[PDB]
Amino acid sequence: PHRYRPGTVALREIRRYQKSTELLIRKLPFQRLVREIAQDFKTDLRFQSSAVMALQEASEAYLVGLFEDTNLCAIHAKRVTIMPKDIQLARRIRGE
Template sequence: MFVSDIQNKANSKPPEDYIHVRARRDQATDSHSLVETVARKAAPTTGGVKKPLRYRPGTVTLHEIHKYRKSTELLIRTLPFQRLSQNLKADLRLQSQAVLALPEAAGACLVGLFEDTNLCAIHAMRVTIMSRDVQLTR
């Protein structure tokens, strides 16, 4: 070999995926850390894309029930409920505040009923409520 060939080999850089480990004859190399560094260099980055949070079945329903429990807005439309109440009892005359109180009370009663019904369905390890759950909560 010529001197210029030896100098060229000494000046040449190893490839990027090449890892040089120097160890003495009786010294063990830490292969675990070597494998980790190789895997870290070889693994492509995913760009930080996270999967959206997925709630367990029934959790979103409970959140909706709590949201409607806290809200002060009417859950049942006023005019259709007013017509229904007039059709049921045509001989009664109701004040306007009494007519407004009826949908509020009915909505609160229904939300409570469905909350207890949903808890019964969850207790039975189901997500879907059934008529037997409603009968149990009455």
């Protein structure tokens, strides 16, 4: 059959997900994650839909910016693969 070399589909995905503007996390698992986090703070608590969408947009923007910093940390160590030490270094430099 026909196989692409590893890296072509990855760069194609980078191009098509930086050209796009949609949300990359499924809505219902994020909603259940938000509800199970919020139930440890206050029980019998409802949620507007716009609140969950705002949380999803903020979370996606935060994770994308963190992965940009993680990628630059990985390039700094003469690598292409990102590792948990890259995320830990990025969060330590930001102050998280």
